[PDB]
Amino acid sequence: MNGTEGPNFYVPFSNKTGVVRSPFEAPQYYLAEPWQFSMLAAYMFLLIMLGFPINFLTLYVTVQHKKLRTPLNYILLNLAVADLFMVFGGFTTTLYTSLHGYFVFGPTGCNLEGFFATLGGEIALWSLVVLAIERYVVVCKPMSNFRFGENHAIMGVAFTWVMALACAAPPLVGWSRYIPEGMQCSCGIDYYTPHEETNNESFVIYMFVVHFIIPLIVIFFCYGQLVFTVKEAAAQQQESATTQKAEKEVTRMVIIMVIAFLICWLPYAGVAFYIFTHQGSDFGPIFMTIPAFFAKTSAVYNPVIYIMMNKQFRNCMVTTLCCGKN
Numbered sequence: 001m002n003g004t005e006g007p008n009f010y011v012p013f014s015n016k017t018g019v020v021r022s023p024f025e026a027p028q029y030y031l032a033e034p035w036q037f038s039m040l041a042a043y044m045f046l047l048i049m050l051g052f053p054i055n056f057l058t059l060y061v062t063v064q065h066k067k068l069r070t071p072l073n074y075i076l077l078n079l080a081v082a083d084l085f086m087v088f089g090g091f092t093t094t095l096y097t098s099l100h101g102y103f104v105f106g107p108t109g110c111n112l113e114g115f116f117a118t119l120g121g122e123i124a125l126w127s128l129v130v131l132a133i134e135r136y137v138v139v140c141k142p143m144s145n146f147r148f149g150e151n152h153a154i155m156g157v158a159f160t161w162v163m164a165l166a167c168a169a170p171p172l173v174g175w176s177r178y179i180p181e182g183m184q185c186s187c188g189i190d191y192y193t194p195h196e197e198t199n200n201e202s203f204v205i206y207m208f209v210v211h212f213i214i215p216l217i218v219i220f221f222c223y224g225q226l227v228f229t230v231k232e233a234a235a236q237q238q239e240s241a242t243t244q245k246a247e248k249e250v251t252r253m254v255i256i257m258v259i260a261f262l263i264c265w266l267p268y269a270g271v272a273f274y275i276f277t278h279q280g281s282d283f284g285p286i287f288m289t290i291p292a293f294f295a296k297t298s299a300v301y302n303p304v305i306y307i308m309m310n311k312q313f314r315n316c317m318v319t320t321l322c323c324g325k326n
């Protein structure tokens with residue numbers, strides 16, 4: 001055998017030596033080297049730490065500025081909030097886990113870090129489809145009068161929750177489970193086990209396709225049809241060159257966020273396929289670890305593009321820093 005199964009735990013090491021145990025009680029030092037263990041948490045603090053002032057000042061820069069109620073900011077505040085739920089939830093759990101070498105809260109606690117990480121790079125996936133549709137409707141024109149605003153900008157934000165909850169809570173209870181992974185300091189969704197009690201088989205596909213492949217294809221459909229709408233379609237619409245100066249820069253940031261959304265998410269999710277297809281494979285702890293935690297950097301770089309490459313908004317932020325200058 002390759003690893004070990006349990007009632008709640010899969011650990012990718014054979015009970016060959018007999019030093020392999022449960023991750024809910026024991027520090028899994030039997031897995032690898034402890035300096036790497038704390039190296040994960042040492043890399044972890046540098047995460048949580050920085051996801052605060054870059055997320056927090058973003059929620060406040062919008063409430064402070066009664067001038068930033070645009071359908072660009074509506075979707076791009078939704079991150080500042082959703083990430084802070086992770087730092088004050090998902091990251092809280094992982095830390096305690098990484099520093100000791102196991103999930104102490106355990107059966108109840110895994111169901112937090114595994115959940116928030118699934119209600120983070122999933123609620124932004126339902127935002128980054130609207131972020132390819134907000135750019136699509138005021139560039140190509142599918143109908144006549146296509147203005148967004150406020151009562152339209154809430155309809156794309158309140159939708160990201162309705163689609164993220166459709167696939168983040170069901171594993172917690174009812175249709176799947178939240179389970180530890182890799183070096184067993186991280187958690188998430190099952191890829192290894194049938195566990196035909198909670199019926200994973202159907203949930204896996206309903207998850208992967210409806211919430212990775214389909215949102216991507218209905219981003220690429222809205223993307224490929226926009227290089228085409230820049231050249232031959234938009235020279236007949238006859239919009240001005242003063243209007244498409246910042247409109248030619250914000251697009252060129254918004255679809256850089258799509259890139260980042262794959263930069264680490266493929267090394268993780270695409271490999272989550274590999275694991276899911278091999279189920280008894282000889283893939284140790286290191287396999288899922290680095291991609292899991294790199295995947296976890298998905299709370300911090302989002303504002304770092306939104307602040308930096310969206311200069312449109314980068315002025316309201318500097319107003320808090322000075323607070324009365326020339």
Ligand SMILES: *[C@@H]1O[C@H](CO)[C@@H](O[C@@H]2O[C@H](CO)[C@@H](O[C@H]3O[C@H](CO)[C@@H](O)[C@H](O)[C@@H]3O)[C@H](O)[C@H]2NC(C)=O)[C@H](O)[C@H]1NC(C)=O
Nearest residue numbers: 004005006007009011014015016017018019020021022023
């Ligand atoms: C992999 O190897 C483990 C080695 O520890 C092994 O744990 C063994 O588990 C048995 C049964 O759970 C324990 O039996 C002891 O506990 C019962 C409680 O009622 C009592 O009869 C005695 O205290 C008895 O010793 C053993 O303590 C334990 N074996 C050793 C060598 O101490 C598991 O089989 C495996 N665990 C996994 C799947 O990670």
Ligand SMILES: *[C@@H]1O[C@H](CO)[C@@H](O[C@@H]2O[C@H](CO)[C@@H](O)[C@H](O)[C@H]2NC(C)=O)[C@H](O)[C@H]1NC(C)=O
Nearest residue numbers: 001002003014274277278279280281282283284
């Ligand atoms: C358990 O681990 C073994 C050992 O690596 C894996 O064996 C695979 O199948 C045969 C051995 O009979 C080899 O020719 C392959 O190269 C192995 N595959 C891989 C991943 O390289 C196997 O993955 C595991 N056993 C099963 C069938 O689940």
Ligand SMILES: *C(=O)CCCCCCCCCCCCCCC
Nearest residue numbers: 064317318319320321322323324
């Ligand atoms: C500039 O850098 C920010 C302003 C610096 C002073 C902030 C004062 C905060 C006081 C908060 C009390 C008002 C809250 C009630 C809102 C209705």
